[PDB]
Scaffold this active site. Structure first.
Site, PDB file in Angstrom:
ATOM      1  N   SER A 179       0.800  -1.238   0.000  1.00 54.94           N
ATOM      2  CA  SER A 179       0.000   0.000   0.000  1.00 54.94           C
ATOM      3  C   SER A 179       0.824   1.274   0.000  1.00 54.94           C
ATOM      4  O   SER A 179       0.263   2.361  -0.179  1.00 54.94           O
ATOM      5  CB  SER A 179      -0.966   0.038   1.184  1.00 54.94           C
TER       6      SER A 179
ATOM      7  N   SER B 242      -5.446   4.180   3.763  1.00 55.86           N
ATOM      8  CA  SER B 242      -5.008   3.125   2.864  1.00 55.86           C
ATOM      9  C   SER B 242      -6.204   2.554   2.093  1.00 55.86           C
ATOM     10  O   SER B 242      -6.245   1.370   1.750  1.00 55.86           O
ATOM     11  CB  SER B 242      -4.249   2.036   3.634  1.00 55.86           C
TER      12      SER B 242
ATOM     13  N   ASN C 204      -8.598   1.223  -0.405  1.00 55.71           N
ATOM     14  CA  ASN C 204      -8.289   0.526  -1.662  1.00 55.71           C
ATOM     15  C   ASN C 204      -9.045   1.012  -2.890  1.00 55.71           C
ATOM     16  O   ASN C 204      -8.438   1.250  -3.931  1.00 55.71           O
ATOM     17  CB  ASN C 204      -8.442  -0.984  -1.486  1.00 55.71           C
TER      18      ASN C 204
ATOM     19  N   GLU D 159      -4.418  -7.143  -6.189  1.00 63.40           N
ATOM     20  CA  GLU D 159      -3.421  -8.077  -6.747  1.00 63.40           C
ATOM     21  C   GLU D 159      -1.958  -7.672  -6.506  1.00 63.40           C
ATOM     22  O   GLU D 159      -1.079  -8.537  -6.390  1.00 63.40           O
ATOM     23  CB  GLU D 159      -3.658  -8.299  -8.246  1.00 63.40           C
TER      24      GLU D 159
ATOM     25  N   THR E 112       2.261   3.828   5.219  1.00 67.44           N
ATOM     26  CA  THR E 112       2.531   2.408   5.480  1.00 67.44           C
ATOM     27  C   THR E 112       2.210   1.548   4.257  1.00 67.44           C
ATOM     28  O   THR E 112       1.455   1.957   3.367  1.00 67.44           O
ATOM     29  CB  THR E 112       1.629   1.910   6.618  1.00 67.44           C
TER      30      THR E 112
HETATM   31  B1  LIG Z   1      -1.965  -2.340   0.931  1.00 65.34           B
HETATM   32  O1  LIG Z   1      -1.921  -2.644  -0.552  1.00 65.34           O
HETATM   33  O2  LIG Z   1      -0.831  -2.706   1.854  1.00 65.34           O
HETATM   34  C1  LIG Z   1      -3.304  -2.897   1.622  1.00 65.34           C
HETATM   35  C2  LIG Z   1      -3.777  -2.246   2.757  1.00 65.34           C
HETATM   36  C3  LIG Z   1      -4.935  -2.670   3.410  1.00 65.34           C
HETATM   37  N1  LIG Z   1      -5.406  -1.917   4.646  1.00 65.34           N
HETATM   38  O3  LIG Z   1      -6.509  -2.141   5.134  1.00 65.34           O
HETATM   39  O4  LIG Z   1      -4.687  -1.073   5.143  1.00 65.34           O
HETATM   40  C4  LIG Z   1      -5.634  -3.774   2.918  1.00 65.34           C
HETATM   41  C5  LIG Z   1      -5.176  -4.439   1.784  1.00 65.34           C
HETATM   42  C6  LIG Z   1      -4.013  -3.996   1.128  1.00 65.34           C
END
Ligand SMILES: *[B]([O])([O])C1=[C]C([N+](=O)[O-])=[C][C]=[C]1
Length: 263
Positions: free
Chosen positions: A43, A103, A105, A141, A208
Site C-alpha cells: 500500500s 489506505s 483501496n 493483486e 505504510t
Molecule cells: B496495501 O496494498 O498494503 C493494503 C492495505 C490494506 N489496509 O486495510 O490497510 C488492505 C489491503 C491492502
C-alpha cells in the site's frame, strides 16, 4: 560493516530481510542497509499515487475539487472511506486523502484510473528521475509479494529519494507539495512503525504498506526534528515463506537504528 551489524541481527531475529535508507537533509549523512534491494511496495504506493494526482492538478483546473460519483463497481475490500461516501461521492482531494491516510483501496484504484493505471503512475515516477519504482497491478493483486517477483516493487533508497523530491524538493509546485506533506502528516495507520521510533515532539508524515504474505510490510516518512533540517527514511521488510508474519516492532526498531546512525 560495523554500522550494519545491528540491522543484520534484527533481520535474523525477524526471520527475513530488512531494507533501510535514511538521509539527514541538513548534514547529508545517510544510513543504508540493503538500501538498493527491491521490496514490494504494497500500500505504500498510495503516497506516490497522491503525489502524481497533485502534479496533474497543477495543469488541470479544479481537478482536485472535482466530485467523483463512483458506483459500487469501484469498491474493493477494505475501502472504509469509499464505502462510507458511496451515496455522497468524493472529490479527487478526498479520494487522495482516503488513499493516503486510511489506505483506502477503492480510492487508490479510482485515482490510478485517473493517471492511466499503474503504467501512468510509473511514468510519473520516471518523470521525477526515479528509474527504480515500478507499479504493475491494481489493488488487491499488487500485494502478492512473491519472492523474486519484481512487479510492484521499489528500493528503500529510491523510495527515500523520491519522497525527498516530492515533500522537500521542487518536483511539485509549492501548494501541491504542502498538500502532500499535510496528507502524510495526517496518516492514521502508522502509529506503531516509524512514528514509534521518533521522539514525541517531532512532526512526522508517513505512508505504510502491508502485503501481509511473505512477512512483507513497510513504512516511509519525513521527520522534522525540533529546530533541525528534516530526515527522510524508508524501512521495508520481506521474508521467504508465504505464512511468515510481518512485524511492526521490527519496522520501528530498524527506524530507531537509522535515526541513531545518522550524523
Ligand atoms: B496495501 O496494498 O498494503 C493494503 C492495505 C490494506 N489496509 O486495510 O490497510 C488492505 C489491503 C491492502
Amino acid at each position: 560493516n560495523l554500522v550494519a551489524e545491528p540491522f543484520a541481527k534484527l533481520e535474523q531475529d525477524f526471520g527475513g530481510s530488512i531494507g533501510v535508507y535514511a538521509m539527514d537533509t541538513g548534514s547529508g549523512a545517510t544510513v543504508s542497509y540493503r538500501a538498493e534491494e527491491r521490496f514490494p511496495l504494497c500500500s505504500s504506493f498510495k503516497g506516490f499515487l497522491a503525489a502524481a494526482v497533485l502534479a496533474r492538478s497543477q495543469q488541470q483546473a479544479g481537478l482536485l475539487d472535482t466530485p467523483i460519483r463512483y458506483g459500487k463497481n469501484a469498491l474493493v475490500p477494505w475501502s472504509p472511506i469509499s464505502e462510507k461516501y458511496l451515496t455522497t461521492g468524493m472529490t479527487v482531494a478526498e479520494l487522495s486523502a482516503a488513499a493516503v491516510q486510511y489506505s483506502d483501496n477503492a480510492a487508490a484504484n479510482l485515482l490510478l484510473k485517473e493517471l492511466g493505471g499503474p503504467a501512468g503512475l510509473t511514468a510519473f515516477m520516471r518523470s521525477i528521475g526515479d528509474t527504480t519504482f515500478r507499479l504493475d497491478r491494481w489493488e488487491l493483486e499488487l500485494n502478492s509479494a512473491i519472492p523474486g517477483d519484481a512487479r510492484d516493487t521499489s528500493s528503500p533508497r529510491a523510495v527515500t529519494e523520491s519522497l525527498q523530491k516530492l515533500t522537500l524538493g521542487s518536483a511539485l509546485a509549492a501548494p501541491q507539495r504542502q498538500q502532500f506533506v499535510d496528507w502524510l502528516k495526517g496518516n492514521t495507520t502508522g502509529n506503531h512503525r516509524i512514528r514509534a521510533a521518533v521522539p514525541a515532539d517531532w512532526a512526522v508524515g508517513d505512508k505504510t504498506g502491508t502485503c501481509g504474505v511473505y512477512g512483507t510490510a513497510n513504512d516511509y516518512a519525513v521527520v522534522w526534528p525540533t529546530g533541525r533540517a528534516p530526515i527522510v527514511l524508508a524501512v521495508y521488510t520481506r521474508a521467504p515463506n508465504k505464512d511468515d508474519k510481518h512485524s511492526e516492532a521490527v519496522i520501528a526498531a530498524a527506524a530507531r537504528l537509522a535515526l541513531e546512525g545518522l550524523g
